[PDB]
């Protein structure tokens, strides 16, 4: 029911959590299991939290309208099924790790765990300091 104002509000509400936390996620719709994917996504939500944006509104123009306030590189259309795993607890949280692991298992593909980050240029994960 993505009406004009309803879709505008939903895009803003989805961008709010993503901008408040770490990078979001994506789950294309190619292949899922009856319980292997259902329980896997259930555990992904349990670890990530109750505010992950599993819904998909990643149309090109919709993103250019709502998401494109800052970091316009994410405004590019994610032409596939989208499910975002919010990650409040630090950068690239356990939800991000779960998406990275499920990129090659328990789902069709995680879109390489593309996400969105404020730097938008550090291809490496949040491991800048070796220590």
Paired tokens of 38:
């259902």
56 interacts with RNA by CB under 7 A: yes
Residue nearer to RNA on the CB measure, 79 or 128: 79
Among 18, 75, 82, 95, binds RNA (CB under 7 A): 82
- Phi first, then psi, for residue 57 (nearest 5°) are -135, 35
Residue nearer to RNA on the CB measure, 51 or 125: 51
The label of the residue with tokens 């069709």 reads: 108
60 interacts with RNA by CB under 7 A: yes
Of 23-52, binders to another protein (CB under 8 A) are 33, 35-36, 39, 42-43, 45-46, 50
Among 17, 19, 47, 59, binds RNA (CB under 7 A): 59
Paired tokens of 77:
């259309």
Annotate 21-90 with DSSP letters as a single string: SS------SS---SSHHHHHHHHHHHHH-S----S----HHHHHHSGGGS-GGGGS---S--------SS
70 interacts with another protein by CB under 8 A: no
Binding site for another protein (CB under 8 A): 33, 35-36, 39, 42-43, 45-46, 50
């Amino acid at each position: 029911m993505a009406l004009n104002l309803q879709d505008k509000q939903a895009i803003v509400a989805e961008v709010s959590e993503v901008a408040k936390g770490a990078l979001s996620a994506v789950v294309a719709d190619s292949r899922g299991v009856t319980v292997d994917k259902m329980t896997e996504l259930r555990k992904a939500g349990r670890e990530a939290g109750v505010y992950m944006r599993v819904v998909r509104n990643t149309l090109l123009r919709r993103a250019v309208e709502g998401t494109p306030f800052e970091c316009l590189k994410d405004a590019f259309v994610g032409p596939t099924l989208i499910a975002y795993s919010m990650e409040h607890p630090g950068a690239a949280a356990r939800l991000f790790k779960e998406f990275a692991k499920a990129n090659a298992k328990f789902e069709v593909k995680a879109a390489a765990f593309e996400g969105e980050l404020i730097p938008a240029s550090q291809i490496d994960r949040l491991a800048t300091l070796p220590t």
